Structures are given as structure tokens and as C-alpha cells.
Design a protein around this ligand. Structure first.
Ligand SMILES: *[C@@H]1O[C@H](CO)[C@@H](O)[C@H](O)[C@H]1NC(C)=O
Ligand SMILES: CC(=O)Nc1cccc2nonc12
Length: 353
């Protein structure tokens, strides 16, 4: 299990002012640290953040958090379930800021909620240094869904922060799972009048000004003021990053199809859209040298119990991540770029059922 630790700096809080925290399994005999970022959508105005506080309060408050948690998938400590990093120090950071890990605004008398996702990550890193992280050699920042996007938004921040604090020997890397979205044309169109009819391109623009959200500096200087929402999209923010990032993304992500207003007898018009979405996602990963993109209709992977089962062209995800490890020291029989080529959901037989 991983034990809960509330942040000693109580000014860094969840949405409702309660302090944030992290769960930790520690491993003396290892200098490897896995920091996982939870996902769970977002909220971008007063009224849908109020609805989130009624039925998704654990994603906005820590007052009801459990006392331990069990690592699963890549966070497991059993080699049978986690052939990749079973012996590493494990950290699980609950997602309680609803800002795609981008906010930097406290609760005050102008703000009903606090959005401090970007600062939650700083404070966890700073407080973990005094518990072993100072002697680490690799800090892998991972996350799923909204946590996957938060990896891309924060991976260079964690590197830069450890450089100014006097720890230049720590190698910061990122693993973004199911956070590689496309701002594409929709299957049916609705203009942003409320929460259900507001596309992510436009909800995130409102979110940034509501959250006071931050983006990677070098991406900000490209799109400049008013256009920071572009940096929330994988193929646009990835080229500006310096830290090595491994990208995992289903070719037909269910969250991508949801925001595209697709709900699965498919006829022609829809057949082309689904096929065009798969080819478009492969085009964006063409220059991503460390990637893993099966042709399945699913969502999330790296922390599910059976994350070892999916294979792309004979290679499982934990093997590709191990091949990634060696490349950071083309390897014979140990590939890192694994993107399916068949063009319909479940054309790969190892897809999750
Ligand atoms: C707590 O965190 C805030 C925001 O990062 C910072 O301004 C403040 O100095 C911190 N306090 C301590 C005691 O570290
Ligand atoms: C759950 C989550 O974080 N979703 C998203 C983040 C960034 C861009 C997106 N485009 O569609 N969905 C997006």
C-alpha cells in the first residue's frame, strides 16, 4: 500500500480550501521515483464546479480521502503485475484541483474555489526531496487522461525547479497516458451555450482565465497572450519540450469520441469520421520517437491491473518502456516507437475487452 501524506504547506489546497497531499510507498534500495498524476475531467465556471462539488467531491476535497491506497498497474510493487518499475519508489498524487493540473490561484473573496494544480506538483516535489528524492537518478512524471495532459504541461517545470534548487543530477522524464487530444472537427456541432454543448477548445479557454492557468513557457511565447489554450493539445506543446516524454494513446480514445459527439450499426458518414480520426492521430505521432498507440476503442491503461496484456506488433507496453529506459543510457529487437497501422477499432486482437 501507499500511505497518505497531507502537504505540510497548508496554503496549497484542493478546490474547497482543504490541504492537498500524496500517497507514498518508499523503497530505500532504489533511486527511481514514479510520480503519477490522477485524472478526472475538469470544471471551468462557478456553476458546473458547484455541480462537481455535489457528486464528485473527492476530486475537489481531501476531507474524505482514505488512509492508504493500493498501487495497481505501473504503480504496483509486484513484478508479476509491473514488469517495468516494480522496485521503484511509488507516489500517487490525487487530482483535486479540476484544472488539468494547470491552476495557480488560491481561494479568496474573489474566488469561490482554489485552482492550484500546477503548485500542487511543485510542493509535492519539494517535500519529497527531504524523504529520499534528493538521492534519485530518474524522476518519471506519469499521468492518465487529465493527468496525462498535466504531464505535458508540467514536466519541464519539474526539471527546471530541481535545477534551481541544486539537484542537476536528477533526470526528469514524462509518461503521458491518454492525454493526447485533437482539436478536430466534430461529428455533430453545437455552439457553447452550456456545459454539454461547449467543445474543449472553448471550455479550456474559459478555464484558463477562471483557473489562472499556466502553460510551458516556451510554448507560451509561440502562441502568446489569449492563445494559451493551444498548449493543452499534445501535438502543439510536445515539440517545445526538452524533457524526454513517452506518449501512450489509444487510436480511438473514448474521451476524444465523447467530445466529438460520437456514441456507438455504423453507417458510411460515421465510418469515414472514425477512420479519419485514427489516421489523423497517427500523423501526429509520426515524429514522436517514443510512443505506443494501439488501434482500440478504450480509455486509460497504465494503472489498470491487466495493463501488460495489450501488444502492438508483438511488444507489450512494459517492454517498450523498458526499451525506452535503455535508449536513454536503435536497439536490436527492443523497439520504442509502436503505432498500429490498421484502420478500425479492435483490428488489433490484443485490445481490452
Ligand atoms: C507555501 O506555498 C506557497 C505557494 O507555493 C508559497 O508562497 C509559500 O512561501 C509556501 N510556504 C512555505 C512555508 O513553504
Ligand atoms: C479530461 C481532459 O483533460 N481532457 C482534455 C484535455 C485537453 C484537451 C482536450 N481536448 O478534449 N479533451 C481534452
Amino acid at each position: 500500500d501507499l500511505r497518505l501524506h497531507l502537504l505540510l504547506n497548508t496554503s496549497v489546497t484542493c478546490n474547497d480550501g482543504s490541504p492537498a497531499g500524496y500517497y507514498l510507498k518508499e523503497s530505500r534500495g532504489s533511486r527511481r521515483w514514479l510520480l503519477f498524476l490522477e485524472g478526472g475531467w475538469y470544471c471551468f465556471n462557478r456553476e458546473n464546479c458547484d455541480s462537481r462539488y455535489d457528486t464528485m467531491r473527492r476530486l475537489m476535497s481531501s476531507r474524505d480521502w482514505p488512509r492508504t491506497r493500493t498501487g495497481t498497474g505501473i504503480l504496483s510493487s509486484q513484478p508479476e503485475e509491473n514488469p517495468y518499475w516494480w522496485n521503484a519508489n511509488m507516489v500517487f498524487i490525487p487530482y483535486c484541483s479540476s484544472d488539468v493540473w494547470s491552476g495557480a490561484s488560491s481561494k479568496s473573496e474573489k474566488n469561490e474555489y482554489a485552482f492550484m494544480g500546477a503548485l500542487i506538483i511543485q510542493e509535492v516535489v519539494r517535500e519529497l526531496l527531504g524523504r529520499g528524492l534528493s538521492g534519485a537518478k530518474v524522476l518519471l512524471l506519469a499521468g492518465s487522461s487529465a493527468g496525462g495532459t498535466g504531464v505535458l504541461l508540467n514536466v519541464d517545470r519539474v526539471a527546471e525547479q530541481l535545477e534551481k534548487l541544486g539537484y542537476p543530477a536528477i533526470q526528469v522524464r514524462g509518461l503521458a497516458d491518454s492525454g493526447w487530444f485533437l482539436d478536430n472537427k466534430q461529428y455533430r456541432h453545437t455552439d457553447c451555450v452550456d456545459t454539454i454543448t461547449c467543445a474543449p477548445t472553448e471550455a479550456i479557454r474559459r478555464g484558463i482565465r477562471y483557473w489562472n492557468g499556466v502553460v510551458p513557457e516556451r510554448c507560451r511565447r509561440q502562441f502568446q497572450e489569449g492563445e494559451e489554450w493551444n498548449c493543452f493539445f499534445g501535438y502543439k506543446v510536445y515539440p517545445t519540450l526538452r524533457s524526454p516524454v513517452f506518449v501512450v494513446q489509444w487510436l480511438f480514445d473514448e474521451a476524444q469520441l465523447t467530445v466529438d459527439n460520437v456514441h456507438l450499426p455504423v453507417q458510411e458518414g460515421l465510418r469515414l469520421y472514425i477512420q479519419n480520426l485514427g489516421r489523423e492521430l497517427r500523423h501526429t505521432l509520426k515524429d514522436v520517437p517514443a510512443s505506443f498507440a494501439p488501434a482500440c476503442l478504450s480509455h486509460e491503461i497504465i494503472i489498470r491491473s491487466h495493463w501488460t496484456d495489450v501488444q502492438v506488433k508483438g511488444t507489450s507496453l512494459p517492454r517498450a518502456l523498458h526499451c525506452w529506459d535503455r535508449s536513454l543510457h536503435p536497439l536490436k529487437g527492443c523497439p520504442v516507437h509502436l503505432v498500429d497501422s490498421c484502420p478500425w477499432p479492435h483490428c488489433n486482437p490484443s485490445c481490452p475487452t
